[PDB]
Amino acid sequence: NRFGTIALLAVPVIGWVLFNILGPLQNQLN
Amino acid sequence: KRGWFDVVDDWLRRDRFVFVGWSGLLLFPTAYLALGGWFTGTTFVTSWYTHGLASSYLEGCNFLTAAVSTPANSMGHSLLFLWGPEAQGDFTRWCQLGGLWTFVALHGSFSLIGFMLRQFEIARSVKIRPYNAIAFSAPISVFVSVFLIYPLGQSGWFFAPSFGVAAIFRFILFFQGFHNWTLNPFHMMGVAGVLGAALLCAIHGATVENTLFEDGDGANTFRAFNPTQAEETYSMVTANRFWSQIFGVAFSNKRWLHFFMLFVPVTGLWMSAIGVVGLALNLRAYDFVSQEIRAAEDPEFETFYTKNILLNEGIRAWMAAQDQPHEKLVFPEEVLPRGNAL
Amino acid sequence: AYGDAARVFAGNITNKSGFIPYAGEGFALLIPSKWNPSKEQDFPGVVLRYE
Amino acid sequence: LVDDRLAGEGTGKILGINDPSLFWAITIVFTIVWGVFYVSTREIDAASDRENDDDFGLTL
Amino acid sequence: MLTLKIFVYTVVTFFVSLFIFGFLSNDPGRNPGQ
Amino acid sequence: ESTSLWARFCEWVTSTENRLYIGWFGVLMIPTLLTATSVFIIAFIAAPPVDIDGIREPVSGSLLYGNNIITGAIIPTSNAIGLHFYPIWEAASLDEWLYNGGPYQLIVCHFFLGVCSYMGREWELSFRLGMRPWIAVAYSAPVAAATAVFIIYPLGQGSFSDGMPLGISGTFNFMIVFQAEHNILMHPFHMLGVAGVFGGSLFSAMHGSLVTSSLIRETTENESANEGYKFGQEEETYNIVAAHGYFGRLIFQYASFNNSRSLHFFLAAWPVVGIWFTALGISTMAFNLNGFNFNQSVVDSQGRVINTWADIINRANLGMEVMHERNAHNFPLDLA
Amino acid sequence: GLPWYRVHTVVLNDPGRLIAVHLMHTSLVSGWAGSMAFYELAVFDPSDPV
Amino acid sequence: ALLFFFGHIWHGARTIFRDVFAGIDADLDEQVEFGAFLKLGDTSTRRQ
Amino acid sequence: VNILGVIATALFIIIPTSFLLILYVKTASQ
Amino acid sequence: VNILGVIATALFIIIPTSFLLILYVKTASQ
Amino acid sequence: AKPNPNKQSVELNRTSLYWGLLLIFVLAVLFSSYIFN
Amino acid sequence: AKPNPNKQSVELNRTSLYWGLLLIFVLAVLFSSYIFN
Amino acid sequence: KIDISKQGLNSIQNETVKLNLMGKSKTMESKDWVDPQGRKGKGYGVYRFANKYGANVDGYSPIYTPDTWSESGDSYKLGTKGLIAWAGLIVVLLGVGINLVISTSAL
Amino acid sequence: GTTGRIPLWLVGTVAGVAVIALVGIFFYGSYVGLGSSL
Amino acid sequence: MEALVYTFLLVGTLGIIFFAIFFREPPRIV
Amino acid sequence: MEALVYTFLLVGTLGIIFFAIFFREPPRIV
Amino acid sequence: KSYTYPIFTVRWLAVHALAVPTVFFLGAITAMQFIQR
Amino acid sequence: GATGERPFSDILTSIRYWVIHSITIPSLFIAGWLFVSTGLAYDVFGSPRPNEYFTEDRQETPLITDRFNALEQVKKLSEV
Ligand code: CLA
Ligand code: CLA
Ligand code: CLA
Ligand SMILES: CCCCCCCCCCCCCCCCCC(=O)OC[C@H](CO[C@@H]1O[C@H](CO)[C@H](O)[C@H](O)[C@H]1O)OC(=O)CCCCCCCCCCCCCCCCC
Ligand SMILES: CCCCCCCCCCCCCCCC(=O)OC[C@H](COP(=O)(O)OC[C@@H](O)CO)OC(=O)CCCCCCCCCCCCCCC
Ligand SMILES: CCCCCCCCCCCCCCCCCC(=O)OC[C@H](COP(=O)(O)O)OC(=O)CCCCCCCCCCCCCCCCC
Ligand SMILES: CCCCCCCCCCCCCCCCCC(=O)OC[C@H](COP(=O)(O)O)OC(=O)CCCCCCCCCCCCCCCCC
Ligand SMILES: CC1=C(/C=C/C(C)=C/C=C/C(C)=C/C=C/C=C(C)/C=C/C=C(C)/C=C/C2=C(C)CCCC2(C)C)C(C)(C)CCC1
Ligand SMILES: CC1=C(/C=C/C(C)=C/C=C/C(C)=C/C=C/C=C(C)/C=C/C=C(C)/C=C/C2=C(C)CCCC2(C)C)C(C)(C)CCC1
Ligand SMILES: CC1=C(/C=C/C(C)=C/C=C/C(C)=C/C=C/C=C(C)/C=C/C=C(C)/C=C/C2=C(C)CCCC2(C)C)C(C)(C)CCC1
Ligand code: OEX
Ligand SMILES: [Fe+2]
Numbered sequence A: 001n002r003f004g005t006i007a008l009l010a011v012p013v014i015g016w017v018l019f020n021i022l023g024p025l026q027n028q029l030n
Numbered sequence B: 001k002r003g004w005f006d007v008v009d010d011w012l013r014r015d016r017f018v019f020v021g022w023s024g025l026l027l028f029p030t031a032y033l034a035l036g037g038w039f040t041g042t043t044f045v046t047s048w049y050t051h052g053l054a055s056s057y058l059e060g061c062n063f064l065t066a067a068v069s070t071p072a073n074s075m076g077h078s079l080l081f082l083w084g085p086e087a088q089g090d091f092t093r094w095c096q097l098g099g100l101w102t103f104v105a106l107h108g109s110f111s112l113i114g115f116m117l118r119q120f121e122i123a124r125s126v127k128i129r130p131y132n133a134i135a136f137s138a139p140i141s142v143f144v145s146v147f148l149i150y151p152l153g154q155s156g157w158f159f160a161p162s163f164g165v166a167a168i169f170r171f172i173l174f175f176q177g178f179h180n181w182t183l184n185p186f187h188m189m190g191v192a193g194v195l196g197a198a199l200l201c202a203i204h205g206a207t208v209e210n211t212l213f214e215d216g217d218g219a220n221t222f223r224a225f226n227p228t229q230a231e232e233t234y235s236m237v238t239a240n241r242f243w244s245q246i247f248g249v250a251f252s253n254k255r256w257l258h259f260f261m262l263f264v265p266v267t268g269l270w271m272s273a274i275g276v277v278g279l280a281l282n283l284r285a286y287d288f289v290s291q292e293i294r295a296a297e298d299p300e301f302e303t304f305y306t307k308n309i310l311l312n313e314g315i316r317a318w319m320a321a322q323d324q325p326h327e328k329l330v331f332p333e334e335v336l337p338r339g340n341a342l
Numbered sequence C: 001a002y003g004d005a006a007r008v009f010a011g012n013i014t015n016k017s018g019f020i021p022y023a024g025e026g027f028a029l030l031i032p033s034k035w036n037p038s039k040e041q042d043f044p045g046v047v048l049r050y051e
Numbered sequence D: 001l002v003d004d005r006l007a008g009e010g011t012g013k014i015l016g017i018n019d020p021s022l023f024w025a026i027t028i029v030f031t032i033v034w035g036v037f038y039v040s041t042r043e044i045d046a047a048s049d050r051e052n053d054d055d056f057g058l059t060l
Numbered sequence E: 001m002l003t004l005k006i007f008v009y010t011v012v013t014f015f016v017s018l019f020i021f022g023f024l025s026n027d028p029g030r031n032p033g034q
Numbered sequence F: 001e002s003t004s005l006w007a008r009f010c011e012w013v014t015s016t017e018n019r020l021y022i023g024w025f026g027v028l029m030i031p032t033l034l035t036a037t038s039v040f041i042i043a044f045i046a047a048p049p050v051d052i053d054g055i056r057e058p059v060s061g062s063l064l065y066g067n068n069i070i071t072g073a074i075i076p077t078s079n080a081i082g083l084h085f086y087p088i089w090e091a092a093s094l095d096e097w098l099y100n101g102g103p104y105q106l107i108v109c110h111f112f113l114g115v116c117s118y119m120g121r122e123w124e125l126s127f128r129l130g131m132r133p134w135i136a137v138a139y140s141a142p143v144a145a146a147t148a149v150f151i152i153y154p155l156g157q158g159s160f161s162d163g164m165p166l167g168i169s170g171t172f173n174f175m176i177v178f179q180a181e182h183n184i185l186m187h188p189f190h191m192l193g194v195a196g197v198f199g200g201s202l203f204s205a206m207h208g209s210l211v212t213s214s215l216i217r218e219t220t221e222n223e224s225a226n227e228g229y230k231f232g233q234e235e236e237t238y239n240i241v242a243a244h245g246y247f248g249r250l251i252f253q254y255a256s257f258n259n260s261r262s263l264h265f266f267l268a269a270w271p272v273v274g275i276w277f278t279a280l281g282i283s284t285m286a287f288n289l290n291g292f293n294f295n296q297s298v299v300d301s302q303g304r305v306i307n308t309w310a311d312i313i314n315r316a317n318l319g320m321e322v323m324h325e326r327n328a329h330n331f332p333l334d335l336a
Numbered sequence G: 001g002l003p004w005y006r007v008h009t010v011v012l013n014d015p016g017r018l019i020a021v022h023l024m025h026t027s028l029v030s031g032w033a034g035s036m037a038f039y040e041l042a043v044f045d046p047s048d049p050v
Numbered sequence H: 001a002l003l004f005f006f007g008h009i010w011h012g013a014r015t016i017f018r019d020v021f022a023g024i025d026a027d028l029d030e031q032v033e034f035g036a037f038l039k040l041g042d043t044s045t046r047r048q
Numbered sequence I, J: 001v002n003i004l005g006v007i008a009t010a011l012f013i014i015i016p017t018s019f020l021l022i023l024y025v026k027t028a029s030q
Numbered sequence K, L: 001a002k003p004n005p006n007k008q009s010v011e012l013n014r015t016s017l018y019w020g021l022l023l024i025f026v027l028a029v030l031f032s033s034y035i036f037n
Numbered sequence M: 001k002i003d004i005s006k007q008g009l010n011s012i013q014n015e016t017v018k019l020n021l022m023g024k025s026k027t028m029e030s031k032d033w034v035d036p037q038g039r040k041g042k043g044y045g046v047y048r049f050a051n052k053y054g055a056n057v058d059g060y061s062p063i064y065t066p067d068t069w070s071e072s073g074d075s076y077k078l079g080t081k082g083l084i085a086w087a088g089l090i091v092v093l094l095g096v097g098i099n100l101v102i103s104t105s106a107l
Numbered sequence N: 001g002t003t004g005r006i007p008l009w010l011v012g013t014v015a016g017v018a019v020i021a022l023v024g025i026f027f028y029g030s031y032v033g034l035g036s037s038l
Numbered sequence O, P: 001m002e003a004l005v006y007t008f009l010l011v012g013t014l015g016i017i018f019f020a021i022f023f024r025e026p027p028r029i030v
Numbered sequence Q: 001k002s003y004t005y006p007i008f009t010v011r012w013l014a015v016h017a018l019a020v021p022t023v024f025f026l027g028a029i030t031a032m033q034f035i036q037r
Numbered sequence R: 001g002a003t004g005e006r007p008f009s010d011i012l013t014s015i016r017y018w019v020i021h022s023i024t025i026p027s028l029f030i031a032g033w034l035f036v037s038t039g040l041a042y043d044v045f046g047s048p049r050p051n052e053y054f055t056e057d058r059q060e061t062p063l064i065t066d067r068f069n070a071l072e073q074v075k076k077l078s079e080v
Helices: A002-029 B004-012 B024-043 B091-096 B099-126 B131-135 B137-152 B165-179 B185-209 B236-246 B254-279 B289-297 B304-323 D020-046 E002-023 F005-013 F025-046 F094-100 F102-129 F135-157 F168-182 F188-212 F240-250 F260-286 F309-321 G007-011 G015-043 H002-016 I005-029 J005-029 K014-036 L014-036 M015-021 M079-104 N008-030 O002-022 P002-022 Q010-032 R008-012 R015-037 R040-045 R070-077
Strands: C019-023 C028-032
Touching: A002 M079, A002 R015, B024 B099, B024 Q010, B091 B099, B091 R040, B091 R070, B099 B131, B099 B137, B099 F240, B099 H002, B131 B137, B131 B254, B131 F188, B131 H002, B137 B254, B137 H002, B165 B304, B165 F309, B185 B236, B185 B254, B185 F135, B185 F188, B185 F260, B185 K014, B236 F102, B254 F188, B254 H002, B289 B304, B304 F168, B304 F309, D020 E002, D020 F005, E002 F025, F025 F102, F094 F102, F102 F135, F135 F260, F168 F309, F188 F240, F188 F260, G007 G015, I005 J005, I005 K014, I005 O002, J005 L014, J005 P002, K014 O002, L014 P002, M079 R015, N008 Q010, N008 R008, Q010 R015, R015 R040
Parallel strands: none
Antiparallel strands: C019 C028
C-alpha cells in the first residue's frame, strides 16, 4: 500500500502531461 | 545502405546532440548503472553488517563520510552476483552483504572500456589521430591496478578502496602505515608527473595569454580571435626569448611542446600503476637494511627514515583493531606503542 | 519488511541522560552510553568491563 | 663563563646595531652609491629627449 | 665574529642601495613602446 | 652615447641582450640564491648532526654521516632557539652553529628573498620585452606555497623546528605529522588544492592530445611532425576547428572551447587558483584552525556511538600522534 | 632522418629480414635459457632437499 | 601484462589510423561542421 | 650495503650514454 | 680476490669500446 | 641481390641528447639510492 | 668571429675498429687475470 | 566567408545587445574613440580581420539565436481555460502533498 | 491564447534561490538531528 | 664508497644542466 | 664470480674474431 | 521562416534519465534532514 | 550550427514548459519525501533504524564469518 500511494500520486502527473502534450506529440509522430 | 548492419550503422553514427555510436551500447548502460549504484549506495544502503560503520545519508552521514563499502573479508574474492551462492536472489540481503561495491566496480570497468572505444570511434569518424584515446590508457591503468589487481593479490575485496571521500582517505592512510607507500620510487615518479603536468598547464596558459597579438581595440582580448583564422594569435618568438632569458631553456617547437604536455602525466600515472601492481603482492620498498643495522648497533644513529618507521608502527598498531574486524585483535592498552606523556 | 515509519518531525530524544542502566547478577549501575563492551579480563573475578 | 659571544640576539636594537662600526659601514656605502647616482641622474633624464617639467613621467 | 657581521652588513647595504637607486633612475622609461 | 659610470651600469643591468637577464630584481636575486645554494650543497654533503628537538638528541642528515639521497636532509633549527634570529655571528663557534641548526635558517631566509626577487624579475623582463605582466602573477602560487611551508607555519607554531625539512624523508615526516595534528585531508582548502593538481594534469593531457591529434600533414612517415613545424612561422600548425568538432562530439557541442584565448586562460586559471587555496589552507592551519572533525557524530537512539570512516581516520591519527616525538613531551597536551 | 624509436620499422615490408630478426630474437632467448641453467647449476646445493 | 596492454592499444590505434599517421588533411572543415550532414563524416547526407 | 650496486650503477649510466653519444655524433657529422 | 676488479674490467672494456664505436658509426654514416 | 630499398638513416639532435642524458642520470640517482640499500 | 679555418673531421674504418676492439679485449684478458689476484 | 545576416541574430530587440552578440561595435571603428582609461584606438575595431574572415568568434558560434527559435512556444495554445485548470490542479496537488507530508510524519 | 514568454534572467534567479535554499536546508540538517553528534 | 657515487651522480646531473643551458642549439627564425 | 668474467672475455674475443673474418670490408680493385 | 522541432528525441531521454532520479533523491535527502535520533 | 533539436533557451522560456513542469518536479519531490518518511527506504535496502543497531542478543558490532552461509548469517544478525 505504501508503493500504491506513490503510484496514485504519480497517476495525475501522467494524466496532466498527456493532456498538455498529446497534440504536438501526435503531430510529430506523423 | 540496404543491409541490417548498414541501416543500424546509419542510425547509430548519426549527427546528434549526444553521439551514440556503436560503442554507446556498451558505454551508456554500464555508466548509467555505475552512477546509479554509487548514488543508491551512498543514499540508502548501509555498511553496518560488512564493516561495522555507517555509510549512508539515511544513517546521518554527510557527503564526505558517505561511501559504498567493500564486502566482508569472509567473502574472499567472490564476484557476489545477485544470483550467486551467497545472496541467492535476495536484493535486500545482497545490498546488506556488500554486493553493490562489486556491482559498481564491474560496471565501471566496462564503462571505461566503452569510453575509450567511443573516443576511437569519434576520432575515426572525424578523420583525425587517436592520441586522445591513447591518453586515456593512464586513467584506465590506474583504475585497473588500484581497484582490481591490488585486491586480487590480497585476502579479498575487503582491502579494496571504497567509493567515498573519507573511505579513500582511510585507504591512503592505510597504504602509508602498512606499505610505506611514500618511500616507493614508482610513487615518486607518479608524484613528479602529476606536479609537472600542473606546472606545464599553468605555465603554458600564462605564457600564451601574456604574449598575445593586438587584433582589436578593446581591453577585453577574448573578442579578438576567430577559430578559422590563419595567423597564430600569440608570439612564439617573444615567448621563446622571454623563457630563454628567464629560465635558460625554452620551447621552439609547438608540436614538441604539446606532445610533452601529453607525455608527462601519462607516464607518471603509468609508473604509479606499476608501483601499485608491485605492491599488490606486498613487495614494498619498506626499509633500508643498512640503516636498520646501523641504528640497531649504534643507539645514537637517527635519521628521518627511522622516525617515519616509528610513525608507521604507531599507525599500524592503533588502526589494526578497528580497520580489520575479522582478525579479532584484542590489544591490552600496555602493548600498544606510545610516546612519553602522549 | 517492518512497516515502521521514520521519526520525521519528532521533537523528542529517546535517551539524553548520557547513561545506560545495567542490571547484573546481584548489582546494578549506570554505564555511560558512549562506551562499548570489552573482552579483557585483567583481574580475577571480572564479570563486567566497558571502555 | 667558558667562552665569549656577541650576546645580542633577542634584544631589540635599532637595525641590529650594537657597535658604531656597523652604522659607519651602512652610512659610507649608502653615501657612495647615492653620490654616484646623483652625479649621473642629470644625464640619465636627458635620454628621454624631454625636460623634467611638471608633465614629466609615465602618465595615462 | 664582529668582522663577519661588518662584512655582511656592508655587502647587504651595497646590494640594497644598488637596487633602490637603480629603480629610482627613470626605470619606467626603459620600454620598447613608442 | 652613455658617458657616466652610473648610466653605463644601468644600461648594462637593464640590457635585453644578455644571455640571462639581470635586471634590478636580479641584483637581489643572484647573490641570495648563490649563497643559499652553496650553503645547501655544503650542508647536504658534510654537515654534523643537528639537535632538532632541543632535547640533546642530534639527528643525522648528511651524506658523509651515513645517509643516501632519499634519507639525507637538512635538519631544521633547534626547538630551544624557537623563532629567535640565529645568524652565523651570534654563535660562539662554527661547531656550536652547526649543532643547533643554523644552515636551515640561513637557507630559508635567502631562498625566500630569492624567490620574491625571481617573481619580480619575471615581471621586469615581461615589461622590457613588450609583453603583458601576469606570468609573475602565475608564479605567486608556488611562491606562496613555499612561503607557507617554510615561514608562515613556523611563525604560527612558535618555532622553526616545526618547519619543513630540506629533504625527501623529512618532507614525508612533515606531511605525516601535519596530518596527525591538523587533519589536513579533511580541510576544504586541501581538497581544492588536490582538485587543482588533478584537474591540471587532466587538462594538460587533454590539451596536448587534442593539439597532437589535429596536426596538418607537412612531412612524410620517416620523420617526426616536429620537423613539420618551422620556428617563427606565421601560419597555425593545427586545426582548432577539427579539435573543437572532435571534443564537441565527445561530450556535447557547448562544452568545448571555441576560443583559443579563452581555453588558454582557463588552463592558466585552474591550477593557479587551486594552489592559491591550498597554500591559504596551510597558512590557516598554521594558526590552529584544523579540518572537519566528524568524530562520534553518528549516535543511535540509546546514545551509543556508531563508527564511520572518519573514526577510522581518527584512529590512524591517534596512532601517528603518540609517536611523532617520543621524548619531547612531558605533559599530556600538544598545544604547540 | 628516422627517430630513434622508429628504427626497427625498416623490416616492416621485408619478409626475409623480418624472419632474420625473429631468428635473432629466438637465438637470444635460447642463449639466455642455457646460460641461466648453467649458472643455476653452478650454485645449486642438492645436499638437503628437505 | 600491463605494459603489453598499453602496447596493444598503441599498435591497434596505429594500424587503424594509418593514413593520418603523418597528419590530417589540409582542408578538413566541411566534414567537421556541426549539423552539416545527417550522418557523421558522410558527405552524401547533407541536410539539417 | 650491496657492493654489487656499483657495477649496476656504472653500467646503467654508461651504456645508454654511449648509445646516445653514438647517435648524436653521427647526426652532427651528417 | 679483489672484488674491485669487476668494475675496473667493465670500465676498461666499455669506455674505449664506446669511443671506437662513436668514431666508426660517424665514419660509416659519412 | 639489388640493394635493399628499405634503407633509412637514424638521427638524434642535441635537445634529444640532453633529454636522454638527464633521464639516465635522474633514474640513476633515484634507483642507485634504492639499490645500494 | 669568422668560422675557424682549422676545422677537420675525424674518421675510423672497420679495420681500425676491429683492431681496437681486439687490442682492448686482449689487454682486458691479461690484466684482468692479473688484477683479480 | 561568414555572412552575419545568416547567423540568426536579427530577431533581437535591443540594438546594443544585438551588436554585442555579433562581435561588432560601431563606436570602436572611429579613429577618435577613447576607452574608459583613456587610450586611443587604431581603427581596428573589435576584431582586426573582420573583413577578411567575415565576422568575429561571437559572430561565428553564437549561443543565443532567436531566429532559430520555434514559431510556437511564445503563445500558449490552451489559453485562459488551460491556465485556470492548471491553477486548480496545482492548488489541489499542493493541498494533497502537504496533507500527506503531515500525516506520514510524527506531527 | 496567452502570448508572451518568461524572462530567462527571472528563471535563473528563481533556480539560484531554490538551490541556495536547498543547500541551506542541508546545512541546517547537518547541525541538528541525525549525525549532529548530540 | 657509496657517498662518492652519490656525489658523482649529483655533480654529473648539475654539469648536464649547465651544458644544456649554455651550449644549446640556438633557435633560428626561418 | 671471476670465472664468469674470464669466460665472457674469451667469448667476446672469439666473437670479435668471427665478425672480423666474416664481416670484413671487401677489398676493391681500382 | 518556420522552425518545427520534435518533442521526444535522444537528448530528451538523456536529459530525463539524469533529471528525474536526481529530483527524487533530492526530495528523499531533504526528508532525511528532519529525522530525530 | 544546430543538430536538429529545439534550443534550450527556447524551451526554458515557454509557458507550456513551465505549466507542465510546475507539477512533475514537485510531484517527484513529494514522492521522495514519502518514500523516506513511510519507512520504505529502511525496508527496501535493509538499513538499520536508530533503535535497531544493537539488539538484546548481541551488544557488539556484527561480523560475518561464513561465505556460503552468508545469507543465513546476515539473516540472523539482522533479527530484531
Ligand atoms: C550493456 C551491457 C551490460 C553489460 C556488459 C553488463 C555487465 C555485467 N553485469 Mg549488468 N546490467 C545491464 C547491462 C549490462 N551489464 C542491464 C541493462 C541491467 C538491467 C538493470 C543489468 C543488471 C545487472 C545485474 C542485476 C547484475 C549485473 C551484473 C553484471 C555482470 C554479469 C555477469 C554475468 O554472468 O553475465 C551473464 C553472462 C554472459 C557471458 C552473457 C553472454 C552470453 C551470450 C550472449 C550467449 C547467448 C547464448 C544463450 C545460451 C542464448 C540466449 C538467447 C535467447 C534467450 C534469446 C557483468 C559485469 C551482476 C553484478 O554486477 O554482480 C556483482 C549482477 O548482479 N547487471
Ligand atoms: C580497455 C579497453 C580496450 C580497448 C579500448 C581496446 C581497443 C581496441 N581493440 Mg583491444 N582488447 C582488449 C581491450 C581493449 N581493446 C581486451 C581486454 C582484449 C582481450 C585480449 C582485446 C583484444 C583485441 C583483439 C583480439 C583485437 C583488438 C582490437 C582492438 C581495436 C578495435 C576493435 C575493438 O573494438 O575490439 C572490441 C573490444 C572490446 C574490449 C569490446 C568488447 C566488450 C566485451 C565483449 C564486453 C562483454 C561483457 C562481458 C561478456 C560481461 C560478463 C563478464 C563477467 C562474467 C566478468 C582497438 C585498438 C582489434 C584490432 O583491430 O586490432 C588491430 C582486434 O583484432 N583487441
Ligand atoms: C611483441 C613485440 C613488440 C614488437 C615486435 C613491437 C614492434 C614495434 N614497435 Mg611496439 N610496443 C610493444 C611491443 C612490441 N612492439 C609494447 C609492449 C609496447 C608498450 C611499452 C610498445 C610500444 C611502442 C611504442 C611507444 C612505439 C612502438 C613502435 C614499434 C616499432 C619500432 C620499435 C622501435 O624501433 O624500437 C627501437 C627501440 C630502442 C632503440 C630501444 C628501446 C629500449 C627499451 C626502452 C628498453 C630496453 C629493452 C630490453 C633490452 C628488452 C626488453 C625485455 C622484454 C621482456 C620486453 C615496431 C613495429 C614505434 C612505432 O610505432 O613506430 C612507428 C613506437 O613509437 N611500440
Ligand atoms: C623602509 C624603507 C624601505 C626602502 C625600500 C626597500 C626595498 C626592498 C629592499 C630589500 C628588502 C629585503 C632585504 C632586507 C635585508 C636587510 C634586512 C635584514 O636582514 O635585517 C636583519 C636585521 C637583524 O638584526 C639583528 O638584530 C639582533 C638584535 O636585535 C642582533 O644584533 C643580530 O646580530 C642582528 O643581525 O634586522 C634589522 O635590521 C631590522 C629591520 C627593521 C626594518 C623596519 C622597517 C620599518 C619600515 C617598513 C615597515 C614595513 C616593513 C614590511 C612589513 C611587512 C612585510 C610582509
Ligand atoms: C639565473 C637562472 C635561474 C634559473 C636556472 C634554471 C636551471 C635549470 C635549467 C634546466 C635545463 C635542462 C633541460 C634539458 C633538456 C633540454 O635541452 O631542453 C631544451 C628543449 C628544447 O626545445 P625545442 O623546441 O628546441 O626542441 C625541438 C624538438 O625537435 C626536440 O626534439 O626545451 C624544453 O624542453 C624545455 C623544458 C625543460 C625542463 C627542465 C626542468 C628541470 C630538469 C630537472 C633538474 C634536476 C636537478 C637535479 C640536481 C641534482
Ligand atoms: C666529476 C667530474 C670529474 C671530471 C670530469 C669527468 C668527465 C666529464 C665530461 C667531460 C667532457 C665534457 C664535454 C666535452 C665536449 C665539449 C664540447 C664543447 O662544449 O665545445 C666543443 C665544440 C667545438 O665545436 P666548434 O665550437 O664548432 O668549433 O663546441 C660545440 O658547441 C660542440 C657541440 C656540442 C656541445 C656539447 C654537447 C654535449 C656534451 C656533453 C654534455 C654533458 C657533460 C656532463 C659532464 C659535465 C662536467 C661534469
Ligand atoms: C656471451 C654473451 C652473448 C650475448 C651478448 C652479446 C653482446 C654483444 C651484442 C652485439 C652483437 C653484435 C651486433 C652487431 C651489430 C651490427 C649488425 C651487423 O653486423 O649487420 C651486418 C651488416 C648487414 O647490413 P647491410 O650492410 O646493410 O646488409 O653488414 C655490414 O657489413 C654492416 C656494417 C657493420 C658490420 C659489423 C661491424 C662490427 C660489429 C661489432 C663486432 C663485434 C660484436 C660482438 C662480438 C661478440 C659477441 C658476444
Ligand atoms: C542500484 C541498481 C539499479 C540501478 C539504479 C539506478 C540507475 C539509479 C539511479 C539513480 C540516480 C541517477 C540518482 C541520482 C541522484 C542525484 C543526486 C542526489 C544529486 C545531488 C546533487 C546535489 C546535492 C548538487 C549540489 C550542488 C549544488 C546545489 C551547488 C553547486 C555544486 C553542486 C552541483 C554539487 C537497478 C535497479 C538498475 C538494478 C539493481 C541495482
Ligand atoms: C656461434 C655458434 C656456437 C655458439 C654459440 C654460443 C656460445 C651462444 C651463446 C649465447 C648466449 C650466452 C646468449 C645470451 C643471451 C642473454 C640475453 C639475451 C640476456 C638478456 C637479459 C635481459 C634483457 C635483462 C633484462 C633486465 C635487466 C637488465 C635487469 C632486470 C630487468 C630485466 C629483466 C628487464 C656453437 C659452437 C654452439 C654452434 C655453432 C655456432
Ligand atoms: C540572476 C542570476 C543568478 C542569481 C541568483 C541569485 C540566487 C540571486 C539572488 C539575489 C538576491 C536574493 C538579492 C537580494 C538583495 C537584497 C537586498 C539588497 C536587501 C537589502 C535590505 C536592506 C537594505 C534592509 C534594510 C532594513 C534594515 C537594516 C532595518 C529594518 C528595515 C529594513 C529591513 C528595510 C545566478 C547566480 C543563478 C546566475 C546568473 C543570473
Ligand atoms: O617539534 Mn615538531 O611537532 Ca610542533 O606539535 Mn609539539 O612541537 Mn613537536 O610536537 Mn607536535
Ligand atoms: Fe596550446
